[PDB]
Amino acid sequence: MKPKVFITRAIPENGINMLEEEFEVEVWEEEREIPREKLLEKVKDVDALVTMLSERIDQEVFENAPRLRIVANYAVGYDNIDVEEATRRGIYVTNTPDVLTNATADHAFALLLATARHVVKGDKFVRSGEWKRKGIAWHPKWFLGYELYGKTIGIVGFGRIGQAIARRAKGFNMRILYYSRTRKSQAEKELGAEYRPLEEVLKESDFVILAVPLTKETMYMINEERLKLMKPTAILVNIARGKVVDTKALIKALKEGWIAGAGLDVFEEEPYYNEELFSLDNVVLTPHIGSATFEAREAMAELVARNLIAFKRGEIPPTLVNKEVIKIRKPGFN
Amino acid sequence: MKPKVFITRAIPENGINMLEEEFEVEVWEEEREIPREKLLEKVKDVDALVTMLSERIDQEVFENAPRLRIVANYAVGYDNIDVEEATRRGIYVTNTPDVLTNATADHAFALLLATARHVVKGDKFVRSGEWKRKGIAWHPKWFLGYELYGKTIGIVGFGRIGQAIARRAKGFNMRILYYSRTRKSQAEKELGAEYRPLEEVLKESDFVILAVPLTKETMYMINEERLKLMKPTAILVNIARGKVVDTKALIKALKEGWIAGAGLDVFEEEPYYNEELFSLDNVVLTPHIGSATFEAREAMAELVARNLIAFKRGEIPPTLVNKEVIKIRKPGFN
Ligand SMILES: NC(=O)c1ccc[n+]([C@@H]2O[C@H](COP(=O)([O-])OP(=O)(O)OC[C@H]3O[C@@H](n4cnc5c(N)ncnc54)[C@H](OP(=O)(O)O)[C@@H]3O)[C@@H](O)[C@H]2O)c1
Ligand SMILES: NC(=O)c1ccc[n+]([C@@H]2O[C@H](COP(=O)([O-])OP(=O)(O)OC[C@H]3O[C@@H](n4cnc5c(N)ncnc54)[C@H](OP(=O)(O)O)[C@@H]3O)[C@@H](O)[C@H]2O)c1
């Protein structure tokens, strides 16, 4: 008698418990991701879905889900969902902005600093015993990295996470440039940031941070010609999506010294293995953990629940991504 | 006819070249550190020394250096120099403050973030191919770390580097507490920082950063009872000196979950190997590279040269650490 939601992953219990008050809830509890054929089977009679970036919510899913009215992504990105087709069908799509902004902006800085200061390579040198075995405490030319103070940070995608990365950069006294679809004077005045065309941001920055969604417009925007514009001392950080960067071109740039290093949280396929990329000591790698804090987790689970419960009550969900759907079908289950 | 300086390491050429205009210069150029017996031989007829933290400038060095009038440490720390004995003897001692503040404060944040967000462990997971081999792109419970935003940072040693770490923490919207020998209202008002007794800082902080010199008073100040006061979710960062922390107690704290993790740039002996410490995935380790930026390097070399040249000219050196020596012997060579 309650509407039915399938949750494709073991998200925090707080969100599951909130949903159990208002829905019949099914939760995929396994460590492994749900196989595609099982996803298609399980959506047969669901009114709602909570999905991860690992599930491709495309036309084929919709065709196999005739009761589905709302998809809540447990993520701020939604490049895994065919939102135009959802809108067509009157299906509401929600995401999780804001509650993971600080985690991801912190992780961008974690990657920036780790890459700039040789933290991963340094740790291996110590931890392996090589430092002790070689017998040399310190040398003035070892492990030299790059300053941030007074340097220019270039933020590609000046949204929630991009602005939060700029806020952190102000603590390092950085000159802040950004490229975005829009220009925002509030954030400009609060942070001292300045808009420039993309190729100017790439030419003038000491650190380039990617914080855009994946769309047709941002696919491979960091390509071979764009990388050639960057400084040979510059560090690239990708916390956005893997396919914003042409990895083949990035490998060439790193090997040939077109840029100095890269910190990457996201990859063209996940999981990822690339022997050539992974052989480089001027890259730092993390497995798509930008939003991985206990608190962001929990807050994302609450927010997915709030969206689905608002929808049940005939309210517009607070983090609806496809507002055009409202005029197509009003909220609620039938 | 020019005074003679021995430089114990291959510091940047800019500083060497400045000194060659005014001194007969000898530079130890080898990768390895100068052996103790060679140090004692080489100081026999020097008027000045430029030393690294690796050289122990103690009474025995002074007794073997009868012309020595000034020691310029290529470091801000000077726990490797017996400054009281230098003063006694009329020997000026200088260091390198300021020019390495931003490098070291950046590295403190590099270690804080790497430890809080599992950057080293994450990189090994990806780079080794384990992420790919296990076949799972992402899991909501994997690699969960700690937020900074709104959290409390406790700075032990509120000097040049400690205040610069607080400046960076303001970009993360942190509540800033500090313990120091003094209280500083300027920095309090600029950064919103508040003084507290040491044990209160340890109890109330989510991140504890050590930025004190090594002195009799700070030796093993982070001991077993102090570690027990910390939060089980708290992260410790040591960019100060290894002997500020009782490593045996720190290992117990990390294994027993008294604190959540530690980022360490400095060790009780350097180089260092500790199999038990190095087996822990909740530690991040770097080989005393806090000041290792190209620019800090260069600026340290210039500053050592400026000190020795000012002294030659009968001027008080700009970063003299033992001001009492001035009344003992005026500056210059004879
Ligand atoms: N690595 C991780 O763990 C992780 C975690 C969270 C998010 N992410 C990813 O980061 C992305 C951004 O997150 P967010 O919350 O900051 O989203 P957001 O607030 O929508 O910000 C994205 C910004 O990118 C701008 N943008 C979009 N298309 C662009 C284009 N073609 N050219 C230039 N700028 C463009 C957007 O412009 P407009 O102002 O015109 O909107 C917006 O300012 C998500 O979409 C996601 O892919 C990754
Ligand atoms: N890891 C690295 O690569 C690296 C690089 C640079 C420096 N260091 C180390 O970091 C240390 C600090 O550097 P810095 O330039 O910030 O020096 P600093 O300006 O002298 O600051 C040190 C601060 O520690 C405070 N302090 C000293 N003794 C204390 C005590 N017993 N209790 C509480 N606070 C005490 C000092 O108090 P007062 O205000 O009363 O002076 C001062 O505020 C150096 O001495 C060095 O050991 C490490």
Residue numbers in the entry:
A (entry chain A), B (entry chain A): 1 to 334
Please share excerpts from the published article on this structure:
Glyoxylate is a small and very reactive dicarboxylic acid molecule synthesized by most eukaryotes and prokaryotes. Considered as a toxic intermediate, this compound is metabolized by an unusual enzyme assigned to the D-2-hydroxy-acid dehydrogenase superfamily, glyoxylate reductase/hydroxypyruvate reductase (GRHPR). First, GRHPR is a dual activity enzyme. It catalyzes the reduction of glyoxylate into glycolate, which is either excreted or reconverted into glyoxylate (futile cycle) and the conversion of hydroxypyruvate into D-glycerate, a precursor supplying in the gluconeogenic pathway carbon.
For the first time, the determination of the PfuGRHPR structure reveals a ternary complex in the presence of glyoxylate. Nonetheless, the absence of a hydroxymethyl moiety in the glyoxylate molecule (compared to D-glycerate) reduces the number of interaction between glyoxylate and the protein and induces shorter interactions distances. Two water molecules, separated by 2.69 Å, replace the single water molecule observed with D-glycerate. Unexpectedly, the catalytic Arg241, which is supposed to orient the substrate molecule, is present in two conformations in the presence of glyoxylate. Additionally, the presence of glyoxylate led to the observation of a shift out the active site by 1.20 Å of Trp138, through a global movement of the protein main chain. A second glyoxylate molecule could be perfectly assigned to the observed electron density and was successfully refined with 50% occupancy. Detailed analysis of substrate interactions in the PfuGRHPR structure described in this paper shows the existence of a tunnel that controls the substrate trafficking. In particular, this tunnel is surrounded by Leu53, Trp138 and Arg241 and is large enough to accommodate a substrate molecule as illustrated by the presence of an additional glyoxylate molecule close to Trp138, providing a view of the substrate pathway.
